Amino acid sequence: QPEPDMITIFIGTWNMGNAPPPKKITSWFLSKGQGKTRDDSADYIPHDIYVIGTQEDPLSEKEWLEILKHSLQEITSVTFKTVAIHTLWNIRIVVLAKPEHENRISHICTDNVKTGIANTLGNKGAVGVSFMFNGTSLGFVNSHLTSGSEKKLRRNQNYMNILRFLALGDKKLSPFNITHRFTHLFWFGDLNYRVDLPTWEAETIIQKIKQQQYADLLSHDQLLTERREQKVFLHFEEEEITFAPTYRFERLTRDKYAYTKQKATGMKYNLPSWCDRVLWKSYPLVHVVCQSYGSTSDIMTSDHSPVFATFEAGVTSQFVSKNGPGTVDSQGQIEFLRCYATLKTKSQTKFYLEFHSSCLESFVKSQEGENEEGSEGELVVKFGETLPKLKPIISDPEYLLDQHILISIKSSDSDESYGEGCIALRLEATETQLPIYTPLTHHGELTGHFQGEIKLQTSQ
Numbered sequence: 291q292p293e294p295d296m297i298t299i300f301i302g303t304w305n306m307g308n309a310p311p312p313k314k315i316t317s318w319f320l321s322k323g324q325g326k327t328r329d330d331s332a333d334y335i336p337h338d339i340y341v342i343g344t345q346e347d348p349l350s351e352k353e354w355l356e357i358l359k360h361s362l363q364e365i366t367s368v369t370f371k372t373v374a375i376h377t378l379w380n381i382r383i384v385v386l387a388k389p390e391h392e393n394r395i396s397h398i399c400t401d402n403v404k405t406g407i408a409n410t411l412g413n414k415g416a417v418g419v420s421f422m423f424n425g426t427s428l429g430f431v432n433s434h435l436t437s438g439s440e441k442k443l444r445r446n447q448n449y450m451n452i453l454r455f456l457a458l459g460d461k462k463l464s465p466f467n468i469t470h471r472f473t474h475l476f477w478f479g480d481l482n483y484r485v486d487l488p489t490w491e492a493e494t495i496i497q498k499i500k501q502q503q504y505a506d507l508l509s510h511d512q513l514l515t516e517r518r519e520q521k522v523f524l525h526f527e528e529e530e531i532t533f534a535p536t537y538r539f540e541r542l543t544r545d546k547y548a549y550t551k552q553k554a555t556g557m558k559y560n561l562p563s564w565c566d567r568v569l570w571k572s573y574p575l576v577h578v579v580c581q582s583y584g585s586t587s588d589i590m591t592s593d594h595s596p597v598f599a600t601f602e603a604g605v606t607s608q609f610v611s612k613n614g615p616g617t618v619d620s621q622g623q624i625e626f627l628r629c630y631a632t633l634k635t636k637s638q639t640k641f642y643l644e645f646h647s648s649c650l651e652s653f654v655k656s657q658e659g660e661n662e663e664g665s666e667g668e669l670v671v672k673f674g675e676t677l678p679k680l681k682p683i684i685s686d687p688e689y690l691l692d693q694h695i696l697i698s699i700k701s702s703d704s705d706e707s708y709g710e711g712c713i714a715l716r717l718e719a720t721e722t723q724l725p726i727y728t729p730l731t732h733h734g735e736l737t738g739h740f741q742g743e744i745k746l747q748t749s750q
């Protein structure tokens with residue numbers, strides 16, 4: 291039975307509005323409704339992994355698991371295994387997998403982050419799950435961010451707190467947050483970004499939605515505009531939105547948007563908005579293709595419609611050779627030439643690099659670089675030809691060209707990371723000097739760049 295080189299992943303996000311679901315929710319898991327929808331000919335084909343994020347979920351874990359498992363069994367005739375379930379208040383994540391995958395999955399982690407302070411601590415935050423699927427690390431975050439059209443900055447703050455403090459994946463990757471720990475990271479939820487147009491334009495917006503003319507609305511979507519100004523979700527992707535806004539509906543129909551201010555809304559308008567989103571970030575040159583992104587039309591218990599996204603995602607096998615794991619394979623090496631970091635920091639300390647990768651027995655510390663002043667004010671840290679030669683555990687190119695090297699640039703004075711990035715070993719050539727590049731981030735904000743050349747030796 292061969293190990294897969296691809297799997298499909300279903301991501302669902304639904305703010306349930308504190309109401310039980312209707313008796314049938316299969317349209318959600320089938321990616322049917324509005325937007326980029328799944329072909330009917332695929333309906334019986336199970337996804338490999340289903341990740342369900344809910345917000346304002348009134349159900350017990352048991353109650354929701356029974357609904358989810360029975361739904362998938364009706365669609366696929368497969369009884370899915372429960373990988374993980376984690377709930378913070380009314381924010382929940384469930385991971386289900388085909389039974390054939392049970393012994394491909396390991397290192398299952400769950401965590402949560404509560405956002406805000408005092409007033410603003412008590413119902414917003416995130417839950418997440420991570421695990422290994424054979425040689426591939428997968429992370430999943432379901433976040434319910436701060437509500438309200440005039441709180442985009444708070445949402446951006448909520449995002450940074452979640453990616454700093456959610457403790458998922460390999461704890462040995464100590465300098466790296468969740469935005470660097472996974473081959474594929476999926477972040478979804480009620481992100482609560484709104485269409486920023488005047489209140490007086492509410493009926494105009496509704497008109498535009500009835501015409502399926504989303505362009506002038508999406509140009510005011512706060513998540514798109516904040517992401518274009520590099521304020522949030524830097525280096526994440528989102529599929530084009532081709533479905534109507536998923537909030538705020540009158541319950542038990544989808545014919546009416548309920549946008550007017552009410553005591554129940556704290557006298558706030560809720561103009562139609564794309565609150566409910568799915569984004570991802572995968573390591574460079576790993577296969578990931580969005581195959582659906584849309585909303586259901588037939589699930590109407592909530593003031594939100596469910597959102598679905600499906601993905602093809604490249605995966606690798608748990609590689610064994612006669613040498614590694616448990617030793618190095620002297621036929622393999624990774625060399626770095628003419629490397630330098632450019633940092634935005636105003637500080638003057640010495641810097642060194644750490645190289646982290648599951649192709650190494652453990653992480654590698656470099657010598658300190660040489661600081662110079664850049665022509666436009668910047669700190670340039672030069673490593674020249676001084677970087678250590680990295681000794682991978684396995685030299686086979688079928689393994690090594692699929693791996694990645696995480697880089698942290700750290701202060702010698704404090705040992706704190708000033709920037710993190712990732713280099714793919716999926717090179718155009720081996721035994722050949724080739725350009726490499728990564729942006730560097732810290733707390734998910736841009737802090738610099740790392741560039742240079744790589745020379746990869748494999749057993750071929």
Ligand SMILES: CN(Cc1cccc(F)c1)S(N)(=O)=O
Binds near residue numbers: 373387388396
């Ligand atoms: C048996 N584990 C993985 C798993 C647990 C539950 C459901 C699964 F589909 C897979 S393990 N290797 O101990 O983490």
